[PDB]
Design a binder for this molecule. Structure first.
Ligand SMILES: *Cc1c(COP(=O)(O)O)cnc(C)c1O
Ligand SMILES: *Cc1c(COP(=O)(O)O)cnc(C)c1O
Lengths: 297, 309
């Protein structure tokens, strides 16, 4: 019933929790209708990040497209959650994973990925060269199935088929979905879903100031979020609501809170679902949660 | 379905996941019966640690005992998971939390509590922290010390949560393995399981004397926690720090589960117990607690290079 044979079954169905203290207005009142933030706690996933969804889907789809025979190696240009997600996803699914990432990459990140069983190959430039290094590696070697998070539709699909529905199920009265925009899968996937099922839903992109998965006709809005607002929001979230989200959630919160504030001001009702893509746990080391908002980090 | 008005409702019903690769024998073979490890993922709780269960319980029980009126302060001598849990739980429940901890305690720990809303008062030269929290709580009628080491609600949160959940998910359970810190988990889930499944083994993973294992306490080392009932435990597996870390590394590496170090101790116990069942040809369903995730322990360096204290 909550018994799984594999950690993989423990994927998605992440809780959606109301932020009573953070919501502009939790209860409908004399002063107007409720403006509610609901956090979709994607950290409750296997590796503790939203990406388990795309990672598993990417893999499963590769299995389906027959791209992926037993014991094959998945090659992925990533150093973070996607890598973690895939490391656990791959290994649990009988695959090996190699992450391509720049030589520059922080020991922590890679020490992490190594921990989860990923093999590492180094790129050289930034992430692009990795995505580009990984693009040549994949190509130089047939044995290696590059899943490519930034372009694999299965990424988007994982939200179209998990996050979205789960959201709609828990929050039929949703008015706003706010999620970070990296790969774009979440907003595109959960985005497309929600737009198909609830009319006038807002799909709000939190971009932390062109993804192959990006679709321009899905996002309704795009908040650009400064790193300071992100951290302060992250700080506020855990401080106020007891949820310890990673930094990207700060972005989202900020957007959600913005969107919240507009709806409050407009006396409109808002049930805003916002994604907590991941926990702060990974981000502690950054020093971001303690100290000056001044974050040279 | 899984929609919550508060984080507090997203407490417990933690997933129980089979460790098919780490299990001594996942599949029953016409030769021998299966010996399965199932990991109760307690890190899937609000603050990411089992403690959210006794934290909440302890508060609601204090609410219940009328100890704890609105905006009262919870005073707890803690600097770890229970603090975090409480910090989350108290705030959500409209209380304030002060953690009493030594002046010695790591910025990391304190900075963490601070971020969850806890107020910090420092003790001095962990034991002296208790007296101070207590002497400090026997002084303001509005400062309520929950005292995880003795508060029955702690035990009770596993008697009422962890234990039932397990049994619901693993009616075939033969073994419960958990760390022994405050003792709540083993006591509570221990008592529960003992009462509902015959022969169930409650196995304490206990750091070896000297070897610190985060979260875990050896019963001979410090104060025996007031909650501790020897009769409950079926066995105590001593576990060295190195096995705990190597086990935590194996767990993530083999099962993709990134657990805190106390889990490694538990895994080690579970695996030992598993290996005895295997060897004896006994069927084992061993549920073992993953009290928290590895995330807080990265900083420790416990997950780079295996020798390192
Ligand atoms: C991947 C990720 C995002 C952004 O999600 P995209 O789907 O890819 O748009 C945000 N936050 C965290 C923690 C992520 O891992
Ligand atoms: C508290 C804790 C334990 C032990 O729990 P008790 O209820 O004291 O038996 C084990 N592991 C971790 C990570 C803990 O925080």
């Amino acid at each position: 019933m909550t018994r799984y044979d594999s950690l993989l079954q423990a994927l998605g169905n992440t809780p959606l929790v109301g932020l009573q203290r953070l919501s502009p207005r939790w209860d409908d009142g004399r002063d107007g209708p409720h403006v509610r933030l609901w956090a979709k706690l994607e950290d409750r996933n296997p590796t503790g990040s939203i990406k388990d969804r795309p990672a598993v889907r990417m893999i499963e789809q590769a299995e389906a497209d027959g791209l992926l025979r037993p014991g094959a190696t998945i090659l992925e240009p990533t150093s973070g959650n996607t890598g973690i997600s895939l490391a656990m996803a791959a290994r649990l699914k009988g695959y090996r994973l190699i992450c391509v990432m720049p030589e520059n990459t922080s020991v922590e990140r890679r020490q992490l990925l190594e921990l989860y069983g990923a093999q590492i190959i180094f790129s050289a430039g930034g992430s692009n060269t990795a995505v580009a290094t990984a693009k040549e590696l994949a190509a130089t070697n047939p044995s290696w199935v590059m899943l490519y998070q930034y372009g694999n539709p299965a990424n988007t699909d994982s939200h179209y088929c998990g996050t979205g529905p789960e959201l709609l199920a828990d929050l039929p009265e949703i008015t706003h979905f706010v999620a970070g925009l990296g790969t774009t899968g979440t907003l595109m996937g959960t985005g497309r879903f929600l737009r198909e099922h609830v009319a006038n839903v807002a799909i709000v992109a939190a971009e932390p100031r062109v993804p192959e998965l990006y679709d321009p006709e899905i996002l309704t809005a795009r908040y650009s979020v400064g790193a300071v607002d992100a951290v302060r929001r992250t700080r506020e979230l855990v401080h106020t609501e007891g949820i310890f989200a990673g930094i990207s959630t700060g972005a989202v919160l900020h957007a959600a809170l913005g969107v919240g504030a507009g709806a409050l001001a407009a006396g409109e009702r808002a049930d805003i679902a916002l994604v907590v893509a991941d926990a702060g746990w990974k981000y502690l080391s950054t020093g971001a949660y303690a100290g000056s908002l001044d974050d040279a980090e």
